[PDB]
Structure formats: C-alpha cells, structure tokens
UniProtKB/Swiss-Prot annotation, chains A, B:
Annotated function: Has an important function as a repair enzyme for proteins that have been inactivated by oxidation. Catalyzes the reversible oxidation-reduction of methionine sulfoxide in proteins to methionine.
Molecular functions (GO terms): L-methionine:thioredoxin-disulfide S-oxidoreductase activity; peptide-methionine (S)-S-oxide reductase activity
Protein name as catalogued: Peptide methionine sulfoxide reductase MsrA 3
Alphabetized Pfam families for the sequence: PMSR
Source organism: Rhizobium meliloti (strain 1021)
Keyword Oxidoreductase carried by entry: yes
Main EC class the enzyme belongs to: oxidoreductase
E.C. number: 1.8.4.11
Keywords: Oxidoreductase, Plasmid
Length: 164, 164
C-alpha cells in the first residue's frame, strides 16, 4: 500500500470525489503543509486543508491519482478554490518520496503543455510533513450529508493524453 | 493489502477497537452472512452486523487480527453479545480464502485448548459472501460519539501464547 497527500480546496469535496477512485483504500482529511502543531478547523495557521489517501498501487497509480486531482480542482488560482478564499484552500502536492516528487513534476509539466487549464499551474510541490487529522465531524462529511457543500467536480476538459 | 470480515456483536464497538490495531488501514461496518439483498439497519434478515477490515499484511497478520477479535468479544454466547440479543449479534469469521479458513480453524482450536474463555467457542466459520455496507450514520460512530454505546473491551485474560 502507498500514501498520497494532496490539497486543493475545501476538504469535504476532495474526499467526496477521491474516495470514489477504484484502488483507493482509505481517505482522511486534515491540516498539513503549515506551521502549527495540534491543528484544528478554526486554528491551523498556515496549514492547507488536505487529504491523505492510502491506495493499492496494483490497482491504481500515483499518476492516475494526480490526474483526478487536476481534474477536480482548479490548480491555477492561488490561495483560493471556487468560493473558498485563503491559504487554507491552496493547491499542493505533498510527496512522500522521490518517485512521487518526479511524477508530480512531470504531471504538472504535462498539465501546462496541454494548454487545457486556465493559466499557469500554481500547485505547490513539497515533501510531506506532519498531517494533523481533522475532527471526526469532518471525516466522510459528504457521505453523511450527500447534498452538502462542494465546489469540486470533474471537468471532462481537464484530462491529459494517456500515453501509457 | 488484505481483507478480513468478522462479526462479534454491535458493530460500533467492533469498529472502535479494531480500527486501533496497528496495520489496519480501513474498516467499514455492514451486514453480512445472511439472506436479504440491500440490507439495512432495520431490515437485514439473517445477516450479522459485521465489519470489513482492510489491512497491510506486512504490518499485521490475519492471525493477530483474530487474536484481537477473540479478546474483545465473548465468542461463547450464541446469538448474543452482552446486552445485545439476536442473530444480528452473533460471532462469525467470514474467510476470504483457504489460508484464512485454516488460520480461523487453528485459532479457534487454540482458543479452546487454552481453557481461558467461558465455554465452547460458538463462532461460525463461513466463506465470505455479499457485504452490505451500513448507512453512513453507522460508520465511525464511536469516533463522532466517543462516549457512545459499546459492550466490547479487551479482556487481558483472553489472550493466547504467542508461539511465533
Ligand atoms: Ca474510513
Ligand atoms: Cl464518519
């Protein structure tokens, strides 16, 4: 099993869509990429709202996970996703090892080369650090409240050639 | 990754304890081992309340999972766990393959040979069949309500010699 850690806006919508990818085993939302320990919803400093994804690499690749990531959030808006404004809502990939770093960089290069997205990619690429799991009320929120708030959705136009 | 499927009483308490075992990646509660399709909380016929456990076999063994199972529920009471009475609350191991069947049988034999449990083991051993995931409100219930109802707890006396 493998771990991916991503940020791309309100974490409810991230989990709602990413949990559906075949080969994803577990998802949990939380605060990561920032300063303060013991982060919480109303007190997480410079952390992004993010998601930790445990997946089966035999069933799904890291690359395919990143492709869904770039399909479901606008990676071109700095410190904002849709209606949600602030550093909490920024786009970031938190790589767990060198292979993930390389694939993240290659994938961003492919995204930009396509010209399909609305401007330069502003997604951060950083090593993963502490992941502060969000409060239980945030986990699986859109399972318990299927009509709840989300600004994430898969754009059919935000897809890459599948050369492999 | 590997899958284990167990039943041993109210599924809230099962998930609360089993989710804490290091090497367990995901848990989900549901209805399994019985008759009716599309099972729900108030309409699941002869199904047991059960739990599906996805684990990393490099970190935790199936045997160790069964050992926790036999530690946290009384496997000697037919169609009952603590205050919860009925076939919904019965003890069962739903094996996913022949290796799990063999380990389940060996583990039950070890349990009985020890004489530490309060009577013969009545746990069913059956091949896994459809697992009807429970409603979102049941998932992670004792995370959202940490003081909520449970009759599960680890008995320090319900442990086996660790010969390996
Ligand atoms: Ca989960
Ligand atoms: Cl939940």
């Amino acid at each position: 099993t493998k771990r991916a850690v991503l940020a791309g806006g309100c974490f409810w919508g991230m989990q709602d869509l990413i949990r559906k990818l075949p080969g994803v085993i577990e998802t949990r939302v939380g605060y990561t990429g920032g300063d303060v320990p013991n982060a919480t919803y109303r007190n997480h400093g410079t952390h992004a709202e993010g998601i930790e994804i445990i997946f089966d690499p035999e069933r799904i690749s890291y690359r395919r996970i990143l492709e869904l990531f770039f399909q479901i959030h606008d990676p071109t808006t700095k410190d904002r996703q849709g209606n949600d404004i602030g550093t909490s809502y920024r786009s970031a990939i938190y790589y767990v090892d060198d292979e993930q770093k390389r694939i993240a960089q290659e994938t961003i290069a492919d995204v930009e080369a396509s010209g399909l997205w609305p401007g330069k990619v502003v997604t951060e690429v950083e090593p993963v650090r502490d992941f502060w799991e969000a409060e239980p009320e945030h986990q699986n929120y859109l399972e318990r409240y299927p009509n709840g708030y989300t600004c994430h959705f898969p754009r059919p136009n935000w897809v890459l050639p599948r050369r492999s």
